[PDB]
Structures are given as structure tokens and as C-alpha cells.
Amino acid sequence: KSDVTAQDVENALTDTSKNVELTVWAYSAKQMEPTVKAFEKKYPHIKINFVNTGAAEDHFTKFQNVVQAQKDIPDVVQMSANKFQQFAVSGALLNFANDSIEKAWSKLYTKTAWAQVHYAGGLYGAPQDATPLANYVRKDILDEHNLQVPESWEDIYNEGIKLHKEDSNKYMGILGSDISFFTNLYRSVGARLWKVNSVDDVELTMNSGKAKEFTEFLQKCLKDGVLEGGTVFTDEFNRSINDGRYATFINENWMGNTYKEQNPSLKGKMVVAAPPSWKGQPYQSSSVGSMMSVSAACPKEKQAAALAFINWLDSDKDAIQSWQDTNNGNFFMAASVYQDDENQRNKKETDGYYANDDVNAVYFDSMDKVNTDWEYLPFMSQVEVVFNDVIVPEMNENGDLVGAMAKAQQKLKAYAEDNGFKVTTDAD
Ligand SMILES: C[C@@H]1O[C@]2(O[C@@H]3[C@@H](O)[C@H](O)O[C@H](CO)[C@H]3O[C@@]3(O[C@H]4[C@H](O2)[C@@H](O)[C@@H](O)O[C@@H]4CO)O[C@H](CO)[C@H](O)[C@H](O)[C@H]3O)[C@@H](O)[C@H](O)[C@@H]1O
Ligand SMILES: [Zn+2]
Ligand SMILES: [Zn+2]
Ligand SMILES: [Zn+2]
Ligand SMILES: [Zn+2]
Ligand SMILES: [Zn+2]
Numbered sequence: 475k476s477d478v479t480a481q482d483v484e485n486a487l488t489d490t491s492k493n494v495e496l497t498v499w500a501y502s503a504k505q506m507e508p509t510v511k512a513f514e515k516k517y518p519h520i521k522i523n524f525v526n527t528g529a530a531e532d533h534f535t536k537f538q539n540v541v542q543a544q545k546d547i548p549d550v551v552q553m554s555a556n557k558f559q560q561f562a563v564s565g566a567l568l569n570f571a572n573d574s575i576e577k578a579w580s581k582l583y584t585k586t587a588w589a590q591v592h593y594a595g596g597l598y599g600a601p602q603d604a605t606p607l608a609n610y611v612r613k614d615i616l617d618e619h620n621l622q623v624p625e626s627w628e629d630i631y632n633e634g635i636k637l638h639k640e641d642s643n644k645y646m647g648i649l650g651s652d653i654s655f656f657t658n659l660y661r662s663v664g665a666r667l668w669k670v671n672s673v674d675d676v677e678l679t680m681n682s683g684k685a686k687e688f689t690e691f692l693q694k695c696l697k698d699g700v701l702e703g704g705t706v707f708t709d710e711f712n713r714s715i716n717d718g719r720y721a722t723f724i725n726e727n728w729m730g731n732t733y734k735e736q737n738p739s740l741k742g743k744m745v746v747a748a749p750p751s752w753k754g755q756p757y758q759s760s761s762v763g764s765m766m767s768v769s770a771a772c773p774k775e776k777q778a779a780a781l782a783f784i785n786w787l788d789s790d791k792d793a794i795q796s797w798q799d800t801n802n803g804n805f806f807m808a809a810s811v812y813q814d815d816e817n818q819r820n821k822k823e824t825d826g827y828y829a830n831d832d833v834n835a836v837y838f839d840s841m842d843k844v845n846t847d848w849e850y851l852p853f854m855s856q857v858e859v860v861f862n863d864v865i866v867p868e869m870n871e872n873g874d875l876v877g878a879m880a881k882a883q884q885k886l887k888a889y890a891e892d893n894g895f896k897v898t899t900d901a902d
Contacts, residue, residue, distance in 0.1 A: 478777050480574040482786065488780035490519045494779040499521045500552040501533040502764060505625060505731075508800040509561045509793050513786055520779050523687070530554075533597040534855070541566040547771040550781050553599050555590040556654060560570035560855040562593045563673060568768040569596030570781060582789045586844050587808035591622035591765050594673035594852075599765030600788040601808035605726035606840035607662055607749040607759045610733065613829055614743045615644060615721045624722065626751045627663070627691065634700030645699065647722045649692060653858045654762060655725065661760040661845050662724075663688055663752040670849040675896045680883040686876070690753070692877040703869030712736070724749050727806055727837050728760060732826050734802050741826060747835045748840060759840040760848075763808060774825075806837055813841070853889065860885050 482821040486494070489510060500506055503526035507712055514522050525548065527533035534557060540547045553561065561567050573619070575597065580588055586603035611623050619640055621633045634646030650656065665684035669677040695701040702719075705711055712719060715737055723729070740839055751757040768777065787793055789809040804821065812818050819838040823831040830836075851857055860882050866883040868878040883899055890897040 476568070476570045476572050478570060478575075478781060480578040481573065482778045483575070483781045486520070486782045487517055487786075490517075491711075493521070494521050494776055495521045495523065496550055496776065496780055496783060497525065497548045498550040498783070499525045499527050499533065499537065499548040501530045502552060503527075505728075505797075505801050505805060506552075506787070509787060509796040511797050512793065515781060516792075517786075520783065522783070527552075535560070537566070538855075541769075541771075544771070547769045549769060549776055550603075550770045550783060551767050551769055553765045553767040555587075555601070555765060556657070556850045557563075557854055557858075558591075558598055558765065558767065559593055559850050560853050561767075562596060562598045563852045565770055567598045568770050568772060569598060569779065570768065570777075571595070571597035575781075579785065582810055583808050584783070584810055584813040584841075586761060586841070586846055587763065589780070589846065590762075591862050599767040600784040602764040602766060602788050603728060603806050604808045604813070604841060605728055605759045605763045605806070606761045606837055606844060607658060607724055608727045608730060609747040609749050609835060610723045610725065610729060611682075611745045611810050612718055612721050612743055612748050613745045615718055621721075623745060623747050623897050624750060625748065625757075626754075630722065631691075631695060631698075633720060634695070634721075635698060638699040644718065645702040645720055647701050647724065648720050648821075649696060649701040649703045649869050650711075650725075651703065651862075651869055652706045653854075653861050654866070655706055656728065656762040656861070658762070659692075659724065660685060660688055661848050662749055664755065664758055664845055664847070666848065668849075670851060670853055673852055674894065675888060676851060676881050676898075678886060678897065678899040679875075680886075680900070681880040683880070689875050689879050693873060694870055696869065696873050696875070699871065703871075703873065715740075726760075727840070730833065730837075731801055742829055745759060745829045746836050747787070748811065748836060757843060758845040759843045761841060761844045769854075799891065804834065806841075851886075852895065853886075853893070856889055857886065860889075 482726050510524050591599045591601050596663050630646050630682050637646055657760050667680050699711045726880045749759055768780045774781050791811050794807050794809050794812055797807055821834040823833050864882040865878045868875050887897050887899050
């Protein structure tokens, strides 16, 4: 049990005669680094060796490599709420849970985000951004085809048929071959793929209930030309954005900033709308986001300063303001000083980029509707491998996503059993 208390963390910042060097690895260097520099200016006794690890996929592989070698491990490492699990369960990350930290830091982060940085009773990071889903809609394309901004998956289907019949170079949306994109859709309609009871006890429901119904719907959308299967955040996707290939894009809301940065020519053409409802339920959402974690290898005499850094970067009021000023005036932060500020909720756009100026109100309503009835599996790295090998190849106009979900469940059951997890599946 970690004996680094909330007071010990604060002492690392006030005890300026105690110089520390911290190595910090991050994939989201573009959005984060100016605020890291602000930390260093404020606390010159804590020097930050900031390492941009490149693409997220390369970051996670690099970190696994150093952990297994037990050598050259960073003190602080960027994680995410749906990819940290396998690192936490394998002992790569410091579990810094204790009563003092829980009492103090729980007041600093919105409860949906604070729950998700726990796993198996341990506490593994400070939440960074929250990522409620938004539908980024090419309103110009919909207007041209006499189509309404869709509020439901039913509308996406019905209007999508009309769009693609009239203009076979455009699709209503993309079904993205990315584990976050795909699982976020299921979570946002209340369709559990699995349930976690303890670190060693899991239930897989990938071929039954609401999940199966939603898979059947996604497959019909692919077959009928409503959604196109393809990669996200690749050059193929980047070209499709500029080309207007997708009338809608339902995604984690950091993308709202990405469009402003990479697609200036789309100014005035998009609306930011709520993600869609399903079967006449009120709409729900999903939020994942990044987190900053401490490695299990971090030396004991560096741990208080490492924790002070992650808490400052992710919740200090000056840091939160820096996150806004250095990312086009908005970044959607989990800190309560952002989430509880009614002037963030009612913040108006002023750059003219989106056709609606109430973008943050849309993001905050979606955050309010996040489906919290959800856990990620202990082995999320293996989940992404199986998704890539088994599910992604069926994301096409003739695909059998239903059969692929059942085969992926079988592979995950075998992996769970081989690694000592108790597992049930809906095929048992
Ligand atoms: C790995 C990834 O981390 C989290 O998503 C990242 C966001 O938190 C961050 O703000 O923005 C990144 C993109 O610039 C996201 O990664 C992309 O990574 C996201 C992060 O997502 C965000 O927290 C934030 O840092 O922005 C980056 C993109 O600039 O996430 C997508 C999945 O949506 C995909 O993995 C890309 O390769 C990443 O670059 C989580 O929220 C994600 O679900 C995921 O775990
Ligand atoms: Zn707790
Ligand atoms: Zn058209
Ligand atoms: Zn077609
Ligand atoms: Zn390419
Ligand atoms: Zn401050």
C-alpha cells in the first residue's frame, strides 16, 4: 500500500531545496507540452525531461518494452482510460491509492473521470481530458440533399440511404477500424460487450442481448451503404475529411479541436451535434480520455514529485487555463474547476469555425449522458489485437460482423483461461 500521502505530494512542491529530475513520456505532446513548460517555470527545482513518443500505438509498445526489460522506464507516462488496464494489472504502473489521496484528489476531478482511473481497487492516474462523443456533421452536404441533422441511428440509416443513392461518392458515416471508435458506439447505446466483477473474474457478452442487436444494425448499415468501413486518423481518413466523404463523424470530442488545426477550409460548413439515440431510448454517450500515470519503477524518492506533477498538469487552475489558451481557446478537461464552471458550459464560439456557436453546450450535455454502466477488460491490449485480427477485416459492404464478434469472443475466452482469469461467455 502506497504511503505517499496527499501532504507528501504537496511537500514536493514547497520543498524547493530538494531538486528532482523527472522523465515524462507523452504521445499527445502537441496539446500538452506548453502546459508542461508552464509547470517547469513555476517549479524550477523539478526539471522535466519531456519525451514526445510519437503516435499512441508506438508509445504503448515502447512502454511495454521498457517495463518487461526493467530498464530505462520513464517516471511519468501518459495512459488512457481504455488502454491502461493491462499495464495496471501486470504491475507496470504505481498504484498510489491511499485514504489521503482519495479524499483530496476525488474533489479535483469529475466523478465519471475519477471512477475510470481506478482499476481492481487501485488508483493509477490523474485524469486529463474527458472525451464525450459528438457528431461532427457536414451541414452543407446535408442541406444540398434536403436532409436533417440526424438525432437517432434510425435517421442515420434512413437519410444515409437517400444520400448515397443520390451521391455515391458520399456516405452518411464511417465505421472506424479503431478499438476506441468501435467500443464507444456500443457503450453510447447501452450495449455491454462484457462485465468485470474482479481483476480475475469476467463475463463476455459479445454475441447476445443488446450488443448482438447493435452488431446486426451496424452490419446492415455496411451492407446497404449507410456506413463505409475504413481506418480513422490515417492519411486515408484525412483525405476523406477534406473531400467531404462522410456527412457525419461520431467521435471523441478532442476531434473538434483537430478540425480547427488541420482543416481550416471547412470553416462554416460543420455543425457539432449530440450523438445519436437508439430505439427510442434517450441518447447516451461515452468518455475515455488520457490520464497521467507514475511508473511502478519510479524511485521512491521521486514519487511525491511525480504525483505532484501529474496532479498539477491535470488540475491546477493555471494549468487548466493554459490547456485552453494553447489549444484554440478550448480543451475539454476532466478537472472539476472546468466541469463545474457554468461559463465553460455556456462558452460561446468566437472564431466562426462551426456553424453553431453553442459547441461547448453540446459537449457538456453529452458528458452528462455518458454511460457509466461499463468497465474495460483487464487485458485491453489483447482486446485490441483480437479486434484488429478478427473484427476489422469484416468491416466492409459484405462483412459478417455478427460472426466476427462471436469468433473474437472465443479467442478472448481462450486467452483469459490461459492467463488464469475466471471467464464465462454467452456461448457457454
Ligand atoms: C490512445 C487514446 O488516448 C485517448 O485519446 C487521445 C486524447 O486523450 C487526446 O486528447 O487526443 C488524442 C488525439 O490527438 C487522442 O488519441 C487519439 O488520441 C487522443 C487521446 O485519446 C486524447 O486523450 C487526446 O490526447 O487527443 C488524442 C488525439 O490527438 O485517440 C484515438 C482514439 O479516439 C486513436 O487511438 C489515435 O491513434 C490517438 O492519437 C483516448 O481518449 C482514446 O480512446 C485512446 O485510448
Ligand atoms: Zn477510490
Ligand atoms: Zn451530394
Ligand atoms: Zn455504394
Ligand atoms: Zn494512407
Ligand atoms: Zn496555479
